[PDB]
What does this fold into?
Amino acid sequence: QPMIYICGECHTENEIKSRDPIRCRECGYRIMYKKRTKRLVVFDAR
Amino acid sequence: RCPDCGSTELVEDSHYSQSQLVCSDCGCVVTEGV
Amino acid sequence: APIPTVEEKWRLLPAFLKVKGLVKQHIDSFNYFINVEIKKIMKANEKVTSDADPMWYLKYLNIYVGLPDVEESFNVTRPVSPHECRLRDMTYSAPITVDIEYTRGSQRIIRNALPIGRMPIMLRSSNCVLTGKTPAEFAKLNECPLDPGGYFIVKGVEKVILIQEQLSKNRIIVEADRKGAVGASVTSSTHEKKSRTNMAVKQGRFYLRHNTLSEDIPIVIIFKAMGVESDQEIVQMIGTEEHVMAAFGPSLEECQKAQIFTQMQALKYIGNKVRRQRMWGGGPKKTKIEEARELLASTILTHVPVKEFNFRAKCIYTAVMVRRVILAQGDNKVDDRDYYGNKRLELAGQLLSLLFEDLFKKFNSEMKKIADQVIPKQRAAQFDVVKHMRQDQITNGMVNAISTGNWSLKRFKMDRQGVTQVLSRLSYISALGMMTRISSQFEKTRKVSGPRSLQPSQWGMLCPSDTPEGEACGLVKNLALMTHITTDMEDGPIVKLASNLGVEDVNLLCGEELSYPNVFLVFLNGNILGVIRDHKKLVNTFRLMRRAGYINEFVSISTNLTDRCVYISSDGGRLCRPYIIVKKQKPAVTNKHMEELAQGYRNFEDFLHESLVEYLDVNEENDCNIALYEHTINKDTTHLEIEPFTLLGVCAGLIPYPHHNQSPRNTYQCAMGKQAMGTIGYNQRNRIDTLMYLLAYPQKPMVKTKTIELIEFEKLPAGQNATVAVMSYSGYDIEDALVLNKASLDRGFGRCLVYKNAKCTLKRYTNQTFDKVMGPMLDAATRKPIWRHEILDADGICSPGEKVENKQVLVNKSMPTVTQQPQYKDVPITYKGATDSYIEKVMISSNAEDAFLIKMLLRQTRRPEIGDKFSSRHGQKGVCGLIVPQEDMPFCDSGICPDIIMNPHGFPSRMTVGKLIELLAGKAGVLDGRFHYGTAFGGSKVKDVCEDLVRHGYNYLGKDYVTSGITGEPLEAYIYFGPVYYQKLKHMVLDKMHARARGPRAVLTRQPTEGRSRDGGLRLGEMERDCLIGYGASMLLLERLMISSDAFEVDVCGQCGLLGYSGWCHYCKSSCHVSSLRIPYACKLLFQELQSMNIIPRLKLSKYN
Amino acid sequence: MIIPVRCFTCGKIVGNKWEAYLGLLQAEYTEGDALDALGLKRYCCRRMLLAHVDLIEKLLNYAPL
Amino acid sequence: LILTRLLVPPLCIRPSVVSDLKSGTNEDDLTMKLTEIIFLNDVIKKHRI
RNA sequence: UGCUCGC
Ligand SMILES: Nc1nc2c(ncn2[C@@H]2O[C@H](COP(=O)(O)OP(=O)(O)OP(=O)(O)O)[C@@H](O)[C@H]2O)c(=O)[nH]1
Ligand SMILES: Nc1ncnc2c1ncn2[C@@H]1O[C@H](COP(=O)(O)OP(=O)(O)OP(=O)(O)O)C[C@H]1O
Ligand SMILES: [Mg+2]
Ligand SMILES: [Zn+2]
Ligand SMILES: [Zn+2]
Ligand SMILES: [Zn+2]
It folds into this structure.
C-alpha cells in the first residue's frame, strides 16, 4: 500500500514504507507531514 | 464471562472518568474502580 | 515668557531602542559571554597537569563556539533552524571546540579542531542564524520577524533566564539586630571567596564576628594584631569627636584589662580563637600565629587588598566602619536594604560564565584524575588525553542547568533554583513582558513585606504598576521602557584619573584626617581609594571627563554628605537611565539636534558623545536634580527627563490613559494582559506547542499608546473593539458581569481557536526490537474500522482533517514486553476530551536514536458563552452573565445595537475614568477616521475629542438618545455608547468545568486524585470541616468524610486490639473475637504506620448500645 | 487573520469592501473620506474596516505552497 | 524502649510503581531505608565473623 | 518535585 507524505520545504509527495529513515529526495530536510484525508467531513456553519 | 447472563462480551468502557469493565449484552458491571 | 519646549524630544526614545531597549540586554550579555568572557575563562585554566609523571601537560590555545549545528547525521553536522529544533524536540546548540597541544610520549602533539562540548545558542545572538536576516529570510526559516528572541531552546522547549537581583558586594551595611543593637556587616566577595564579617556593640564595646573564629574578639585586639599597636593611633583612626571617644572608651578599657599590647600577643590571642577545618591535611608545625595572620590578611576583608602583609588599608577600612557604627549609634540613620542603589542585576551572561567556569574546572579535574590513574601503570603505550576527553560532560551540564533550572556550584557554594522558566506563549505581549522580568533574591516563601513595597528608587528603572498579583506581589518586577544595565569596566583609567586629581594616599596620613569635617573619603567598588578636600571640584571634573569620553559613560560617581563619602562605582549590573543634560536653565538638546536626528544626520551615540544626553545611575541621580518638563526647569537643575511615559514598562504600556485610573486597576490589567488571547506571530501556523490560543478576527486598538507603536503590538493584536454601552440591563450584570449580544457572537465576535499538541514516541530499546504501529483493526462484520479506530489511516496514524471524539485512538502504538518471539502489548494514545477536536496537521520526525516522534495538532473552534472571562484593557475583568438576542438589545437613532453591556456600578468604587476617556477617544476616532493616543501623562485631551464629536453631529459627552428594545419606549436617561477594546482571556468555562463520579483512587490512600487531568475530586478542606462542625450537621460530615471518601471495613480482634484479615487474627491465632468495623481508610493507614513506629494502638471494641 | 464578512454590531456586508478600501489607500484618499465614499455612515463599520489588520498575507508568506 | 526488631510495614504503606518505560521502578524512601538497615546488619555480621 | 497562573 502506497503511504504518501509531504516534505517541509520541497512539499513533494514522497512514498516511504515502514521502518524507513525519515528523509526526502533532492534535499535533506527531516520534517515529514501527512497529507489530508480523502474522507468526507461535515461542518456546521454555527 | 458475565456473572449474570454468562456472555463473554466484556468491554472496558470508561463512563465519565470511571474505568469500568462491563458486559456489553446485559450491561452487568463486572469490575469498576482502579 | 514661557521656556521654549522641544516637541520632537520624544524622538530620542525610538533611536535609543535601535541599539538598546527591551530585548537587547540578554542578547548583548550572551554575546559578551561567548566572545570575551569564555576566552578569559579558558585563559585562566589554559594549562592543566598531573603531579605524577612530571613534564606532562595539556595546554589550551584557543576555544571556539562556531555556528549552531545538529548531530543527527552520522558523524556529519548540518545547519538547523530554531523552528526545526522546536519541532524535533532537540536542543539548539553549537559545538564548543578548542585547539590544544599536549605531550603523548614527551613528543608534542597538537590538535587544531577538537570538539569538547555543546553550548546552547541564545536566539538572535551573534552566532545565532536568525541575526542579520530579513523578514523574507525569516519566512524561509519559519521564524516570526517580530519575535523578541533572547531565549534558549532545549529539547524543544523555550527557556528564559530571568534577570537575578541581589545585594551589592563589598559594601558596609549598618543595620539593627534582633535585640535592637545597631551593628555592621560587610560581605567581602572576591573572585574566589565570599566572607561576611560582622561587628556588634552587644555590651557597649565592639566585637568582630567571623565564621573562621570560635568566639568574637574585641576590635582593639584586631587593631593591635594588624600592625598598629599604639592606642592613640587607633583612637585617631576611629575619630576625634568627644562622643566618639566616649563610646570607644569601653573597648580600650576591655583591651587594657588583658595583657595584649603587642602584635605578637594579639596574634596569639587570635590564633587561640582559631579552630582547624576538621583536621586539615598536612603537618601544622606551629601555625597558630601564622594561621591568625593568614586569616587577617586573606580571609578577613578579602576585598581590601594587602600589598605585602601591610594591613594599613585594612586598618583604615575597619576604623571607618567603627566610626560609621559610632555615628549610627546616635541618630538612627540606619541604611535600608530596599534601596536599589545597592542592588545588582545578574543577566544570563554572568550566570553562564560562572557555570562554564565550574564545568571547565570539573573537566580539568577529571582529566587530571584520569591521567594520574592511567599514565604510571598502563603500558609502554603512551597515554593521551584525546582518548579520554569526554565531550558529553559540558553538554549535559549545560542542558540540565538550562532545562531543570537548578544551579549547584560547589566551587562557589551557590544553590539556586528557578533560574530558568518556560517562556509563556499565551500572546506576543506575554512573551515580550516575560523577557524583561526580574526575580528577587528573597525567593518568596514567607511574608517579608519589606522588599515587596514600591520604593522611590525604582523611578525610571522598573515599572511600578507591572507586578504579578498574588503571592509574588512585589518580588517579581519588570524593567522600564527606557533602561539599561551596565557591564564591567577595566577600572584602570578611573584609578589613574583619581590619583591625578589630587586624591592623597591613605598610607601617607594618619586616621585623624578622617575625622575632619572638610575631608571626604573617596571609594572604588568598596575599596578605600583615598581622601580628598573640596569634593565639588573632584565630582565636577570627573563628570566632565566622563562627558568628554576619556572615562566610560557607565562609570557612576555619587557623594554622601551625611557620611562624607564619595562613591565611584564601575562594576556591572547597575541600572542606568539616559537624561538630557541641563546647563544654566537651558537643555543642551535643541530643536536643531532633533531635526538632525529625524533626518538621519546623527544617532543616539552622537548625542552621547556631544555631551547632550548622559547615563545616570541611582546613586548618581540621588545627588542630581531632574526636571520632568521644560516648564519645571529652575536654576538648580542638572538634568531633564526625556519622556515621562517611559516610567511604565511593556505590559503597562497597553493601558490607555493609565494616569486616570487606580493603581490596582493597572496591576490587574497588566496581569490579565499577560494572559490576553491573540496572535503570537507570523509563524503561528507552523508552530506546534502544547497549548495555543488564537483569535479569529483580531483588531488593533483605536486608542493606542506610543509604546504600542514602539513594540509593534498593532501588528499582532490580542483583542477586538466592540461597541460597548455602559448601562444596567436585565440584572444579569450585577457584580463585574457583562451581557453579550447573540447576533454579535453569531457573526464572529469573540470567536477563538484552541490548539493542543499530542506527541508520541516510538523508540528503539537495547534489544533489537522497536515500537511499531499497527493498522486499523477492521471489523470483520462490516469490513470497516471500529468506532475507536475510525479516524486512523492505513498506517495506524490519525489523518488530519477529521474530527476526534472522546476515547478515540490517535496513534495505534504497540510496544514489546520482552524489553523467543516478540510479544507486543497495545498502549494507544487515546484522546481525553469533553468536546470534539479537529486534526490540523500531523508531523512525523526521526531523531538520531531511530525514535519516531509523531505530533498531532488538534484544533477546537470555540464561541463565547456563559462563563468565558473577558477583559476591557482597564482591569475590569468580567464574566458573560447573559447572551440576549439582537432585538432585545437597546438601539440608538442610527440603529446600532451594543455588543457588550457592562455594569456602571463598577466605576465609582474603582474610579476608572481612564476607561471613559478611552471610550470617548475611540468614538471620536472611529467617527473621524483617526487613531487617538492614550499616552501616559499626555495623549489626546478631552476637549479635542469633544470637538470631534460635536463636529460629526454626535453628543459631546458620548451619551446618546436610546430607545429600549424590549418595550419600544425611549429610556429616561441617555446611554453611554462607544467602541471599547475588549480582550478575551484564556480562562474558559469549558476547560474549568469539572465533575467527579466515583472514579479512580490513589494507591497509598484510597481517596480521589488531586487534579482535573487526573480525574480528581474536590477536597473538603479543614475550614469546610470547621463550617460543618459549626452547623452541627454530624451525619452530613460523616457521610462526606467517611462514607463517600475512604470508607472501608476492617477486622479488629477484641482480645488483643489489633487489626485482623478475613475474620482472623494472626497475633492470637484465633477468630472468635474478630469483628468487622467501619473505618476511614486513612485511619487504618495511620494505625498501621503507628504500629510500624512501635506506637501500637489497641482498640477496645464494644456494642453500639 | 482575514477581514470578517459581517459587521459585529449591525451586520452590514463589509468583507466585499476591504480590497477596494485598500485601493482607496493605494489612491490619495485618507481614512475618513475613503470610509465615507465606501458608504459606511455608522461608526461601527468604520471601526470594523479601520481597526482590521490584514494578517492573511503574512501567514501565506509562511504557507507551504 | 530499646528496639531489637524492626517492624517492616505492609506493601500498602509502601506503594511501588512499575515504570516499564525504563529499567527501574519507583519505590518509596521507607523501602530504601529498610534495605540499608538490612545491608548494615549483614555488614556487621560479616565484620563480626 | 519544581514553577506560571486563576480569587
Ligand atoms: N522533579 C520532579 N519531582 C516530582 C514530580 N512529580 C512528583 N515528584 C516528587 O514526588 C512527590 C510527589 O509525588 P506524587 O506527585 O504524588 O507522585 P504521583 O503523581 O502519585 O506518581 P504516579 O503514581 O506515577 O502518578 C514530590 O515530593 C516530588 O518531589 C516531577 O514531575 N518532577
Ligand atoms: N490568597 C487568597 N486567599 C483567600 N482568598 C483569596 C486569595 N486571593 C484571592 N482570593 C479571593 O478573591 C477575593 C479578593 O478580592 P478583593 O481583594 O476583595 O478585590 P481586589 O482583588 O482588590 O479587586 P480590586 O483591585 O479592588 O478591583 C476574595 C477572596 O475570596
Ligand atoms: Mg473574585
Ligand atoms: Zn523535500
Ligand atoms: Zn487477637
Ligand atoms: Zn457595521
About this structure: Residues 1-65 of chain D form a domain with the Arc Repressor Mutant, subunit A fold (CATH 1.10.10.60). The radius of gyration of chain D is 13 Å.
